[PDB]
């Protein structure tokens, strides 16, 4: 918009992400507004009745979600229809995105906030970030602010977390649901230390095999 150029890009290396399309009835709204203005000019005073509410929504529905979860529908099918389209960082400069469906519903009848797309919030996080539960209730940087700066192990036992996230539908959980007590017990768990149960260790918790390969290959045994 600053300069009138139009750019088409089709090269490799373009990051892209699907986004649900937001449709509205702005044309009908403008037609109704013009009709109401004409009515005012006529002095009939029903112009208020001519105007119609503005509606912006997305074609995604609960049935589509059920089909997606059932495997009937795929992202290719959605893109083939008008539900969603791929957006790149270059084109994202021309997109006004509602960060969640809650925002779209909040501004459903707001002609002042016409949105071009709806974004699922979890889309702003990677798999590693999505592993952590209730990440929005924690400030992950301050967690590491203290920790900032500074041969294969096979573990026998793993369990699904009691509070599972979406990230565990695509990776194998590695860990255990350990009973943690948040208490002061003798001052042996200070400065990020942790007191462990000897029986928990003996029972095989976090026990495994470490493999080191001598593939490349004084007083010594030789016997």
């Amino acid at each position: 918009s600053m300069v009138d150029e139009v750019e088409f890009w089709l090269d490799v290396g373009r990051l892209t992400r699907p986004l649900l399309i937001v449709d509205n009835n702005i044309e009908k709204y403008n037609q109704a507004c013009y009709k109401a203005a004409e009515a005012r000019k006529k002095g009939d005073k029903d112009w208020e009745k001519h105007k119609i509410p503005f509606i912006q929504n997305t074609r995604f529905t609960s049935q589509m979600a059920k089909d997606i979860l059932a495997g009937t529908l795929t992202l290719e099918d959605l893109v083939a229809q008008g539900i969603c389209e791929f957006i790149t960082p270059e084109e994202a400069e021309n997109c006004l995105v509602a960060f969640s469906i809650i925002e779209l519903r909040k501004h459903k009848h707001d002609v002042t906030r016409r949105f071009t797309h709806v974004d699922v919030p979890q889309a702003i996080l990677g798999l590693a970030a999505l592993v952590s539960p209730y990440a929005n209730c924690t400030q992950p940087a301050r967690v590491t602010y203290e920790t900032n700066q500074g041969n294969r192990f096979f573990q026998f036992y793993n369990e699904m977390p009691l509070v599972k996230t979406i990230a565990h539908n695509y990776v194998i959980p590695n860990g255990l649901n350990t009973i943690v007590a948040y208490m002061i017990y003798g001052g042996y768990n200070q400065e990020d230390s942790v007191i462990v149960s000897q029986s928990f260790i003996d029972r095989g918790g976090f026990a495994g095999t470490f493999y080191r390969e001598e593939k490349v290959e004084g007083a010594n045994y030789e016997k």
Partner: peptide, 29 residues
């Protein structure tokens, strides 16, 4: 000869060294 394959291999050897979450993240890195 050996120079082609060995040199391409070496270009891959420099760093570029590969639980499942860590490997998948390294791929996505």
């Amino acid at each position: 000869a050996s120079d082609l394959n060995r040199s391409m291999e070496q270009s891959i050897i420099s760093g570029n060294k590969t639980n499942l979450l860590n490997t998948i993240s390294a791929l996505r890195t």
